[PDB]
Amino acid sequence: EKSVSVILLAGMPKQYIPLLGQPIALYSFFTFSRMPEVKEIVVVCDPFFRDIFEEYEESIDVDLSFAIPGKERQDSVYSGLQEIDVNSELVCIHDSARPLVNTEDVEKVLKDGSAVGAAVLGVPAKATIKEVNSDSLVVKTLTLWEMQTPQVIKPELLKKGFELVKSEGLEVTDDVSIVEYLKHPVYVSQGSYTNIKVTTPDDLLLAERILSE
Amino acid sequence: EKSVSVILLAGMPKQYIPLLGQPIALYSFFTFSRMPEVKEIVVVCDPFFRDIFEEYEESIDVDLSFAIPGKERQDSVYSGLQEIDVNSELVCIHDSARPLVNTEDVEKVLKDGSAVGAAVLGVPAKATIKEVNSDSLVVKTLTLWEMQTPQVIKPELLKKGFELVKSEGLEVTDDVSIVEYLKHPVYVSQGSYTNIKVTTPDDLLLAERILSE
């Protein structure tokens, strides 16, 4: 109970576009806030948009906090991280552009991150995917998973991760780069294909189509 | 309701010495936490001592947050201020070395700070007090109040106050110096002589003697 801090990345921009009357960011915001495990939500957003969340503060069963976004996604995470409760035992990082994450999937990834130290929701990639070299030739082989959010990580591990990133200088080029640099295991919790990220005009449509089905 | 953020200055050090079994800092901590007006307490303390407060987190009706102290009292306040809720309408700064503040006095100073923008609990000075010049001669005259805490201030005013202090460079030498520099009025709410600050060995004794009377 109340052991999880959520860092909600929400920094109109796509995540504030209404989906059946409700700004996209609020769907996942509410799904987390209903979970007894979740103590607090740190929303990382431009101050312009804070009222979208703060309107619901006395109606939700979590503490709401805010953090200013950074230039890169990892900067926004770090800013978020600085606001979580000092004794939270797990941090749950979520992209607000994924409004359709199911409670049941969040529960799974929370359990796996608690168990392993670091877990991310993933689905099996449907496309044929190949590594290609700098001569544009296929790197051959004789299973790939697409990562979603949440990403759930013990805060001490995330902090050592940042310390390593900051000090060395090492690059974040994809969304699981910090934990990779540690030699700590990262579990992939199987999610749902419905947990789409809303990027395009077209995605907005897909999300409405899924909220009605 | 839940419009007030308390900045509790608690950065053994005197404020952690037991008074009938309970570290001094917890007396005012609990008095504020029982007040419906109070949304959150930001405790400004060395991380060593955080557990003293965090033990009571699920038993109190406020959000608990922490801030790292600074070198001067005003630095500790500013650190505190950076952690309060973005829409809190009043900040209540209290010295944890004043464990005996009465709820009724806190209520008064909250009302006065809300009304005026800035209020502090005070009592009439009992001693004969004189201004003295640099030749050690009395500066003559043909009513003085001793300030206590809480100090209650609208956060926007406290922030402009800090902006002015930081930029100009002006000195804080006493405990109402920031608001003085503004030309905004500061109301003195009459408190109680029992609201002692625990400094000496002897004070510790006085506080026990007052908790029993």
Ligand SMILES: O=C(O)c1cnn2c(O)c(Cc3ccccc3)c(Cl)nc12
């Ligand atoms: O923000 C980025 O772009 C990023 C780059 N790397 N990386 C990470 O390693 C993590 C930690 C994590 C990965 C997998 C499962 C749980 C936590 C995060 Cl939360 N963001 C990033």
Ligand SMILES: O=C(O)c1cnn2c(O)c(Cc3ccccc3)c(Cl)nc12
């Ligand atoms: O920390 C100090 O030493 C200090 C120096 N000046 N000053 C202030 O003007 C205030 C603001 C205030 C004063 C009176 C009533 C309400 C708020 C505070 Cl809260 N601390 C200080």
Ligand SMILES: [Cu+2]
């Ligand atoms: Cu898409």
Ligand SMILES: [Cu+2]
């Ligand atoms: Cu004394």
Ligand code: NA
């Ligand atoms: Na509204």
Ligand code: NA
């Ligand atoms: Na205890």
